[PDB]
Write a protein that binds this ligand. Structure first.
Ligand SMILES: Nc1ncnc2c1ncn2[C@@H]1O[C@H](C[Se]CC[C@H](N)C(=O)O)[C@@H](O)[C@H]1O
Length: 246
């Protein structure tokens, strides 16, 4: 008979001012006008302009939620530990900010870690905070403009940063990360998780659902090997999900 199923439906959502959308396709037509890098009008530009004045401090990268740091880092460490045949040579910290993840996790697990961050005062502070540590290159670029060499990384970290990518560029970037992995490499993707999206009109970003992410992974040609919610996460915050992708 008629029955609930345990598909490519439109994903609706809204922004933080309360404008609503029937689909993501409708939203990107609204949000991706003009020069994307215009600081006042541009999807990307507005986000970069927002970050220009964020303090280069842990409080700054954690949106004033400093106290979630320890649990976040322990969850990632336990998750990465569990990945079968994960390599331990080279890592890349994408949207690195001041190098928090590199400083507290990657430098303990990888022989060399590179950093990718488009905001100059964030990247500069990372250089200072990471002085005398197993760090390689400091790449001043956005994810969507970065060129990564093939067959290089055993881990590619994308945490609290893919919210700034358009879906088109999310798809492109994850496929580009895939070719940058070694055979024992994984993308480590850690992000806030909504089945509707929320455009944040303050920092020009969006939070997507698990189904939305997976739609994008499928389009990228990238597969989920492992996934898990961050345990012991404050109940009032968006859930934080980790994905290991190959
Ligand atoms: N398009 C983009 N590509 C790469 N990084 C970006 C982009 N837009 C914003 N960012 C950066 O993303 C960072 C988000 Se704050 C999170 C920082 C770090 N991943 C951590 O968890 O500690 C900021 O440093 C900001 O400058």
């Amino acid at each position: 008979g008629p029955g609930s199923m345990p598909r490519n439906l439109p994903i609706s959502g809204r922004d933080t001012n309360g404008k609503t959308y029937r689909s993501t396709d409708e939203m990107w037509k609204a949000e991706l006008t003009g020069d994307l890098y215009d600081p006042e009008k541009g999807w990307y530009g507005k986000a970069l302009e927002y970050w220009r004045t964020v303090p280069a401090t842990v409080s700054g990268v954690l949106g004033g939620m400093d106290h979630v740091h320890d649990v976040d880092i322990e969850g990632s460490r336990n998750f990465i530990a569990s990945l079968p045949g994960h390599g331990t040579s080279r890592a890349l910290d994408c949207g690195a900010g001041i190098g928090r993840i590199t400083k507290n996790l990657l430098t303990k697990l990888y022989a060399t870690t590179d950093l990718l961050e488009p905001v100059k005062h964030m990247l500069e502070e990372a250089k200072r905070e990471l002085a005398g540590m197993p760090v390689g290159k400091f790449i001043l670029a956005s994810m969507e403009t970065a060129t990564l060499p093939p067959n290089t990384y055993d881990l590619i970290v994308i945490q609290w940063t893919a919210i700034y990518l358009t879906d088109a560029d999310f798809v492109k970037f994850f496929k580009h990360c895939q070719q940058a992995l070694t055979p024992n490499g994984y993308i480590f993707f850690k992000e806030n998780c909504s089945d509707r999206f929320l455009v944040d009109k303050e920092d020009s970003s969006l939070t997507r659902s698990d189904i939305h992410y997976k739609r994008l992974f499928n389009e990228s040609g990238v597969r989920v090997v492992k996934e898990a919610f961050q345990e012991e996460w404050p109940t009032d915050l968006f859930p934080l999900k980790m994905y290991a992708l190959k």
